[PDB]
Every structure is written in structure tokens, then in C-alpha cells.
Amino acid sequence: QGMNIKPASEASLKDWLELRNKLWSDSEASHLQEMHQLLAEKYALQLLAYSDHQAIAMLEASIRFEYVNGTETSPVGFLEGIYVLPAHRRSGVATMLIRQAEVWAKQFSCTEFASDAALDNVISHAMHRSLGFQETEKVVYFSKKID
Amino acid sequence: MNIKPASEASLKDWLELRNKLWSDSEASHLQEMHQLLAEKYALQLLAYSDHQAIAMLEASIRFEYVNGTETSPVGFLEGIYVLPAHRRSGVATMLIRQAEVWAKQFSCTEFASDAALDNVISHAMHRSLGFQETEKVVYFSKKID
Ligand SMILES: NC[C@H]1O[C@H](O[C@H]2[C@H](O)[C@@H](O[C@H]3O[C@H](CO)[C@@H](O)[C@H](N)[C@H]3O)[C@H](N)C[C@@H]2N)[C@H](N)C[C@@H]1O
Ligand SMILES: NC[C@H]1O[C@H](O[C@H]2[C@H](O)[C@@H](O[C@H]3O[C@H](CO)[C@@H](O)[C@H](N)[C@H]3O)[C@H](N)C[C@@H]2N)[C@H](N)C[C@@H]1O
Ligand SMILES: [Cl-]
Ligand SMILES: [Cl-]
Ligand SMILES: [Cl-]
Ligand SMILES: [K+]
Ligand SMILES: [K+]
């Protein structure tokens, strides 16, 4: 319908920032430096969706060559994050973005698209299932300093 | 006891420990193992008691995003298997120590890992090995395809 999706760019950095920061909180300067890197990374995809003149959603994805939990192939496409403004969550925009993300990943001859979500974000689990993802594994991460 | 990297000569020693940890065909395991042997960013250690291989550890340097970490790249613990009769031996501590020395050659400052959510045994082990929990997540997949 009345929506369009385009890759993010320098012209749309402000739009992308607003949405990105609602998903992952950080300083503008930190987000912005990261976003410029992503623009120059061929294995990253960053899409915005518009309704009228308004940015309403964003998707970020990557191509992962390192092992991803739950997958059977490598490389795979990987959903790094998706955010749709609350008032626009009944528009199928998230489906439209994932579809375009899959077309992108196919260029790399990927056959699987993987993703993850925080264990307690059960709403996001429901959203993944609506987008056609099936749960593979639940895991707990650990870390330690060596230096 | 004796900890040494896997080699073309220890490939079967490695395989019959590896296949008890991760499910794959022998053919898939071996093709992967050969590649892993040549990869500078992949570690594979075996431990030997007398002359039996009684444990293995695999690790890597991960350059892509790792949940819960604060730096990148990072060392990453991919798996540890110990034969049941040696699980009270402390061999896993000795393997992890060596894996840290290995990761330090790259100026890594952080060593990460994960475990299945339902593998409470591995959770204890990670803590015993000096790791602290960071994040819990659920993975998903769909065919494109
Ligand atoms: N989308 C769901 C996922 O969100 C996060 O991962 C995501 C990270 O939070 C993202 O990191 C981003 O957000 C974090 C803060 O959360 C910033 O510090 C960082 N600079 C910024 O790039 C990173 N770029 C992508 C990664 N998939 C969770 N760690 C895991 C969760 O399943
Ligand atoms: N150590 C704990 C982890 O074990 C597995 O990950 C591990 C994977 O199972 C390992 O993959 C192995 O096992 C998978 C099957 O599980 C095979 O497809 C693959 N070819 C084979 O190499 C892969 N090479 C390393 C990865 N950390 C679990 N998916 C996650 C768990 O936290
Ligand atoms: Cl989440
Ligand atoms: Cl549901
Ligand atoms: Cl596990
Ligand atoms: K890009
Ligand atoms: K190696």
C-alpha cells in the first residue's frame, strides 16, 4: 500500500537514529559513528520504511560467516534488530522489511535467515513467529576478562 | 596431564571425543575438522591421560558480534568435552588456562562463551572456570531458501 522501503543513507541518518535509539539506547555520537561504519560495510543491511514522509520502521541485518547457534549452514543472513513504531504495528511493515532482507541475503547465496531475541522479550518471540521464524535454541552467554 | 593441539595425526582422537559432544555425520565432522586445523583463529586442544585422549576444547577468535561482550574481537569458548571417568579431574580448568594463553597471543582482553539454557551443569562449570553470566537469548531460523 502507501508505504515504501529504502536503504538508509547519509541523507536519512537522522530518521535512522530516532528509530535505532528507541531500540538500543546510546549516545548520538556513538550511534552515529557506528551507523556510518555500517553504511560502508557490504555485509550489513540497514533498511527504513516510510509511511508518507515519516520514517515508521527500521531493520538491521548482517551476513554472518562465523557459527550462528541453531543454524545448519554458513554463511547465513542474520536479523540484528527490527523496530516498528507502536502505531504502525498492524501494517505488515515488519513482513515487508524481512522480505527485502531475505532478497538481500540471497545475493550471498544464503539459504537460512537466523535471528535472536532476549529470553524475556516474549513479545519479540511472538513477532519472530509471525515473520515465519521458528525457535531453534535457547542459550545463556558468559564472559570473563583475560587482560 | 599432557595438553597438546590437535593435528592431522591426532584427528581420530579428536573425532571420537568431538562426536560425543556435537551431532554430525563422520564425513561432516572430518571435513570441518580439516579446515579448523588450518585456521589460525581456531583452537583445538586435546588432553591425554597416559596415552588416551580424555578431553578436548575448541575455541576461536570471533570477529563478528557476540552477545554480552563489551569488546570485539573476543576469544570464544566453543565447546569442552571430557570423558565421564575424568570429569572429577580438573582437566577442564587446565584446558581453559591454555586456551586463555592462546587467545592472549592476539591481544584479546575478553573471553566469552555460551551454554544451552537447560544445561545447568555447564552453567556451574562456566562459573567454576571464572566466567560470569551476561545475557540469555533465544535463537530463531527460517529457510529463505
Ligand atoms: N535484536 C535482538 C538482540 O539485541 C541485542 O543484540 C544486538 C546489539 O544490542 C546491537 O548493539 C547495538 O546496541 C547496543 C546496546 O544494547 C550498543 O551498545 C551497540 N553499540 C549497538 O550497536 C548490535 N549492533 C546487534 C545485536 N543483534 C542483544 N544483545 C541480543 C538480542 O537478541
Ligand atoms: N558450547 C556450548 C554450545 O554448543 C553448541 O554450539 C557449538 C556448535 O554446536 C558447534 O557446531 C558443531 O555442531 C553442529 C550441530 O550442533 C554442527 O552443525 C557443526 N557442523 C558442528 O561443528 C560449533 N562448531 C561451535 C558452537 N559453539 C550450541 N549450539 C550452543 C551451546 O552454547
Ligand atoms: Cl530482544
Ligand atoms: Cl504465540
Ligand atoms: Cl551446552
Ligand atoms: K551497508
Ligand atoms: K588451528
Question: A5: Cβ–Cβ under 8 A, 6 or more apart, which residues?
Answer: A47, A48, A49, A50, A96, A97, A100
Length of chain A: 147
Of B107, B137, B144, the CB nearest to A105: B144
User: Could you give the 3-state DSSP secondary structure of residue B49?
Assistant: strand
Q: Which chain A residues are Cβ-neighbours of B41 within 8 angstroms?
A: none
Cα of B66 vs centre of ligand 1, distance in Å, is 9
Which approach determined this entry? X-ray
Q: Going by DSSP bridges, is the β-strand pair B110-116/B74-82 parallel, antiparallel, or unpaired?
A: parallel
Burial class (CB in 10 A: 0-12, 13-18, 19+), B116: middle
User: Could you give the 3-state DSSP secondary structure of residue A100?
Assistant: helix
Residue of B58, B126, B139 best to disrupt the A interface, most CBs of A under 10 A: B139
Read out DSSP for A29-40? HHHHHHHHHHHT
CA dihedral (A142, A131, A110, A117) in degrees, to 10, reads -10
Where in the sequence is the domain holding B73, given as residue range(s)?
1-145
CB contact under 8 A, B114 and A62: no
What whole-number distance in Å separates Cα of residue B33 and Cα of residue B44? 9
Q: Which chain A residues are Cβ-neighbours of B123 within 8 angstroms?
A: 140
List the CATH number of the domain containing A77: 3.40.630.30
Q: Are B109 and A76 in contact (CB under 8 A)?
A: no
Of B108, B112, B143, the CB nearest to A141: B112
Question: B123: Cβ–Cβ under 8 A, 6 or more apart, which residues?
Answer: A140, B115, B133
CB contact under 8 A, B139 and A139: yes
Among positive and negative, which fits the CA dihedral A63, A67, A69, A72?
positive
To one decimal, the resolution in angstroms is 1.8
Q: Supply the angle between the helices A122-130 and A93-107 in degrees, to the nearest 10.
A: 70
Q: Going by DSSP bridges, is the β-strand pair B132-143/A112-118 parallel, antiparallel, or unpaired?
A: antiparallel
Nearest ligand, CA of residue A24? 1
Residue ranges of the alpha helices (H) in B7-112? 11-21, 26-38, 91-104
User: Could you give the 3-state DSSP secondary structure of residue B107?
Assistant: coil
What whole-number distance in Å separates Cα of residue B94 and Cα of residue A27? 41
**Ligand 1 close to Cβ of residue A24 (< 6 A):** yes
Question: B142: Cβ–Cβ under 8 A, 6 or more apart, which residues?
Answer: A112, A113, A131, A132, A133, A134
The three three-digit cell numbers of residue A140, written as one number = 545463556
What whole-number distance in Å separates Cα of residue B124 and Cα of residue A118? 21
Read out DSSP for A51-66? ETTEEEEEEEEEEE-S
Buried b (16+ CB within 10 A) or exposed e, B41-73: ebbbbbbbeeeebbbbbbbbbbebebbbbeeeb
Q: Supply the angle between the helices B26-38 and B11-21 in degrees, to the nearest 10.
A: 120
Beta bridge partners of A58: A48, A83
- How many domains does the structure of chain B reveal? 1
Give the residue carrying C-alpha cell 541453531: A70
What whole-number distance in Å separates Cα of residue A1 and Cα of residue A95? 13
Q: Are B2 and B48 in contact (CB under 8 A)?
A: yes
With left for phi above 0 and alpha for psi between -120 and 50, is residue B99 left, alpha or beta?
alpha
Burial class (CB in 10 A: 0-12, 13-18, 19+), A92: middle
Buried b (16+ CB within 10 A) or exposed e, A122-140: eebbebbeebebeebbbbb
What whole-number distance in Å separates Cα of residue B142 and Cα of residue B40? 31
The three three-digit cell numbers of residue B31, written as one number = 571435513
Q: Which chain A residues are Cβ-neighbours of B60 within 8 angstroms?
A: 66
Of B107, B126, B144, the CB nearest to A110: B144
- CA-nearest of B32, B87, B24 to B55 is B87
Give the residue carrying C-alpha cell 554458513: A74
Question: B43: Cβ–Cβ under 8 A, 6 or more apart, which residues?
Answer: B5, B57, B58, B59, B60, B99, B102, B103
Q: Is B81 annotated as a binding residue?
A: yes
